[PDB]
Design a protein around this nucleic acid. Structure first.
Lengths: 123, 129, 82, 150, 205, 80
RNA sequence: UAGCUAGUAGGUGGGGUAACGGCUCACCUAGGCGACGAUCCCUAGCUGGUCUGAGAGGAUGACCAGCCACACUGGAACUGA
RNA sequence: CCCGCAGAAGAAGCACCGGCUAACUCCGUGCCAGCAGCCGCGGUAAUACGGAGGGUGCAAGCGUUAAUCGGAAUUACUGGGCGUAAAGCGCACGCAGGCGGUUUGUUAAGUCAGAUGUGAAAUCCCCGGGCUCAACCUGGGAACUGCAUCUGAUACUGGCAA
């Protein structure tokens, strides 16, 4: 383009909306949850995986996946949600926070201790 | 139509050097003879002469040392659609000073060195490789 | 009025004053007209640590400025010589 | 004493009547630490012979690159297919800063410190032969002096 | 801070004597060089370029016994100053008080020199210096006061010091367990095994 | 001396009133082009001397009324 | 978001401020602004600076300084330099 | 801030170990149990899932997330592109803009020199001083990349006349 074309109209950027409609740029929010679900993965892999529907305090309704081994979620309880996305299941972009608020942690886990939030035993 | 003869003959000599000619002819003006004088005093071009009153024209002859060309590259930086202006400290140094720079000053047109001792800023014309 | 007060910029438990001329109604270390000198109370064995410009303060006294107690004691301590 | 070091290796295919049959390729540069740097390219059936073939071919295509002290004199451009490169002297210290598939071809040149960067798409096969002709276009003051007065 | 671990593990992993054990029998039964310990450390690991850089960084770090943050700040300060970066960095690092105490010969290892420093022993200009992060200035005096006098450790260190090379830039002195600092050391006296440029290249990325 | 500016009328005539425009070049802070720029004032005059399309200088003085703050002194190249 | 604006733009005479002033009054003119963004919408206190990148830039206005506008929500003044 | 008391005492954790990127071997699980940032790994031999032992990286902290910039030459001025990929209007004709052949004088509006006033003090930077060492405080310079005025320069554009 020629310089006159620019001085008539300047260049334009891109908004580049982020991947978390959780919005407010807040790393963590609080929810209450309503029920439990199980759904199939996509083609190249196959297993059973657990998710949960959470009705947050901002009027948003989204679904999050729960990692670990076992859980203690039923009806409604208080949990913490963090950033992060799971590529396999279509329609989830959140990870539940293990070992905080009300979601109790896993048992007997020894390797990779910091995550999953369980009181590390000192013997 | 035509918009500048300076760019015209710069492109002409570049293409002539690429095609390995031995003579280039074009009309003349005071700017042309000044730039030719500066180039010849520095020494890229062999010589020049003028002929004709009502339709004067310049002739230039290139320079060779062996089959490799002499004028490695050339381009006009100032365009009739966008001007350039530099202060004393802003005289650019092409090819780490090995090359040359054509600068038009208040005192005339000469190399960058004499401008630097005189400390005068002006116009920029072309970059010779 | 126009006075000559004291202001500090140092860290906790380590003062460092800077004598300046400004308006009375302004803050301690805020708006000021022009710096004139400084004083280091803790100082050291080194001689430096007490400097002024007698000419400017004399001019400002001529224009109609007043004095504070500590700066008056300081200038009496130094004067041209004491 | 000449130096050498491998850069990259990848497989290929032909898919002839019987099925897929393979072969391997290698590329390598050489340098004596005082300029005069060449490269080679060859293919064979297996890597241990492929690299040997590449090095034995690499002895050809020698060039002569003028160098000053330990840094390159003036900037230089470089273009080939779809890659472009840029360089700058940065006299003394700071070592050499450059991207991958560029470090080796410059290291054997002998320059102990230089600054450079490559533009655009950077497939290693194409990127090489850019610094080569870039150094080929280089001029030291003696040559330009040899055509203009002093 | 500090390492607090099996030192000859790092001696063996690096592949060269690290001068940090410094007993009397500098012999094989102590070290077992060229083994690269671990479960199956017999295999050659086939280093890469980034690995070469990281290993050189590990060697230069462990030889002088410093953590990471201090090293990064040292590189920042060296780069801020004029001159060649690598030489300036090595000269600056050499100026640490513990290293010059070791080189004077009042100890056997740098770590024990630091242990001596932390316990209020070394004396300068009639004033105690607490920490080994101190930067010595040209034309200073290193000495030991009388509370730590008549300790056999310093005498043993003095007797075993002569096996080293007594670098020229520092005056050996030690007539009455007293010394004198002269100038900044330079490239010639220090060992030529260390390659400066690679560290700078590593921090480039 | 007294600072002056030169301009062009391109304006109708009200009772004791003319409008003037002035021009000057400037370097754009981004692309380096030079673009003509126009600014407009209002003037208080005397005896409505000047006419449409005339060149006249100008100088500032006490604020007289809204948007009217400059007055003329001399007129050069009378008429077109 | 393509046409906006009658005390709106000037002139004449009176009244009111520390002062010129459509700051207000009665009269006379037919105007002023606009494609080099007027009116109309959504959004935000402003700088010396901060962060980042080599430079150009790009986001940002936390504390410390400078200046404004604000004291339950709407409006008025007395008093006083 | 100094001096004294037998006193090893009273004091270490956290991530990773297929490529991207430093470091691996066994047992149980066997499209279930599951990870993961992209490639994707799992049906009987997992250097990737769970445990054990070793190794690797930082350490009074280490990992997870949220947000900003460069890697991005992926808004391209310094620095990209339009035959076949995302891209040249269906063609012409012409206001408002932009840009102009070639001489000689005049003009100082651009532009360039020199001086003056002004770009508040912190910070950013360089020589030093001090708190046992730095963090932190501070003495003197440096730039605030402009603005305005005055005196000069006339090769190139600009206004003038032939």
């Amino acid at each position: 383009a020629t310089v006159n074309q620019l001085v008539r109209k300047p260049r334009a950027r891109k908004v580049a909306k982020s991947n978390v409609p959780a919005l407010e740029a807040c790393p963590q929010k609080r929810g209450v949850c309503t029920r439990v679900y199980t759904t199939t993965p996509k083609k190249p892999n196959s297993a059973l995986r657990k998710v949960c529907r959470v009705r947050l305090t901002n009027g948003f309704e989204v679904t999050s996946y729960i990692g670990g081994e076992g859980h203690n979620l039923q009806e409604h309880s208080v949990i913490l949600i963090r950033g992060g996305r799971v590529k396999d299941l279509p329609g989830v972009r959140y990870h539940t926070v293990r070992g905080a608020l009300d979601c109790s942690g896993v048992k007997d886990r020894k390797q990779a201790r910091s995550k999953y939030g369980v009181k590390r035993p000192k013997a | 139509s035509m918009q500048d003869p300076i760019a015209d003959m710069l492109t002409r000599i570049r293409n002539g050097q690429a095609a390995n000619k031995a003579a280039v002819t074009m009309p003349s003006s005071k700017l042309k003879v000044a730039i030719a004088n500066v180039l010849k005093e520095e020494g890229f071009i062999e010589d020049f002469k003028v002929e004709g009153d009502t339709k004067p024209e310049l002739e230039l002859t290139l320079k060779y040392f062996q089959g490799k060309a002499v004028v490695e590259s050339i381009q006009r930086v100032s365009r009739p659609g966008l001007r350039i202006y530099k202060r004393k400290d802003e005289l650019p140094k092409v090819m780490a000073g090995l090359g040359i720079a054509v600068v038009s000053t208040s005192k005339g047109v000469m190399t960058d060195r004499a401008a630097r001792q005189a400390g005068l800023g002006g116009e920029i014309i072309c970059y010779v490789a | 009025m126009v006075t000559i007060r004291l202001a500090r910029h140092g860290a906790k438990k380590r003062p460092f004053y800077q004598v300046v001329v400004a308006d009375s109604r302004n803050a301690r270390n805020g708006r000021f007209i022009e710096r004139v000198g400084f004083f280091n109370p803790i100082a050291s064995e080194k001689e430096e640590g007490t400097r002024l410009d007698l000419d400017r303060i004399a001019h400002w006294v001529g224009q109609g400025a007043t004095i504070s107690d500590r700066v008056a004691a300081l200038i009496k301590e130094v004067n041209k010589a004491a | 004493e000449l130096q050498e070091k491998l850069i990259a290796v990848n497989r290929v295919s032909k898919t002839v009547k019987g099925g897929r049959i393979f072969s391997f390729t290698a590329l390598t540069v050489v340098g004596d630490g005082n300029g005069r740097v060449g490269f080679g390219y060859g293919k064979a059936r297996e890597v241990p012979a492929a690299i040997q073939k590449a090095m034995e071919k690499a002895r050809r295509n020698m060039i002569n690159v003028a160098l000053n002290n330990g840094t390159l004199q003036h900037p230089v451009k470089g273009v080939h297919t779809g890659s472009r490169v840029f360089m700058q002297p940065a006299s003394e210290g700071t070592g050499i800063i450059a991207g991958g598939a560029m470090r080796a071809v410059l290291e054997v040149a002998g320059v102990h410190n230089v600054l450079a960067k490559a533009y655009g798409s950077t497939n290693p096969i194409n990127v090489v032969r850019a610094t080569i002709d870039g150094l080929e276009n280089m001029n030291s003051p003696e040559m330009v002096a040899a055509k203009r007065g002093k | 801070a500090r390492y607090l671990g099996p030192k000859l593990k790092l001696s063996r992993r690096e592949g060269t004597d690290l001068f940090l054990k410094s007993g009397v029998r500098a012999i094989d039964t102590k070290c077992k060089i060229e083994q690269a310990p671990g479960q199956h450390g017999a295999r050659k690991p086939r280093l890469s370029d980034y690995g070469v850089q990281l290993r050189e960084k590990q060697k230069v770090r462990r030889i002088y016994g410093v953590l990471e943050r201090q090293f990064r700040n040292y590189y920042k300060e060296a780069a801020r100053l004029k001159g060649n970066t690598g030489e300036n960095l090595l000269a600056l690092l050499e100026g640490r008080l513990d290293n010059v105490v070791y080189r004077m010969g009042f100890g056997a290892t740098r770590a024990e020199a630091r242990q001596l420093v932390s316990h209020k022993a070394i004396m300068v200009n009639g004033r105690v210096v607490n920490i080994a992060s101190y930067q010595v200035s040209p034309n200073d005096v290193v000495s030991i006061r009388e509370k730590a006098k008549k300790q056999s450790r310093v005498k043993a260190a003095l007797e075993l010091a002569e096996q080293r090379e007594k670098p020229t830039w520092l005056e050996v002195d030690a007539g009455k367990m007293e010394g004198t600092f002269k100038r900044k050391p330079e490239r010639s006296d220090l060992s030529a095994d260390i390659n400066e440029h690679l560290i700078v290249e590593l921090y480039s990325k | 001396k007294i600072r002056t500016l030169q301009g062009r009328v391109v304006s109708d005539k009200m009772e004791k009133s003319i409008v003037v425009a002035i021009e000057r070049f400037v370097k754009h802070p981004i692309y380096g082009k030079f673009i003509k720029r126009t600014t407009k004032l209002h003037v208080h005059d005397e005896n409505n001397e000047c006419g449409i399309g005339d060149v006249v200088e100008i100088r500032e003085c006490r604020p007289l009324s809204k948007t009217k703050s400059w007055t003329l002194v001399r007129v050069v190249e009378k008429a077109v």
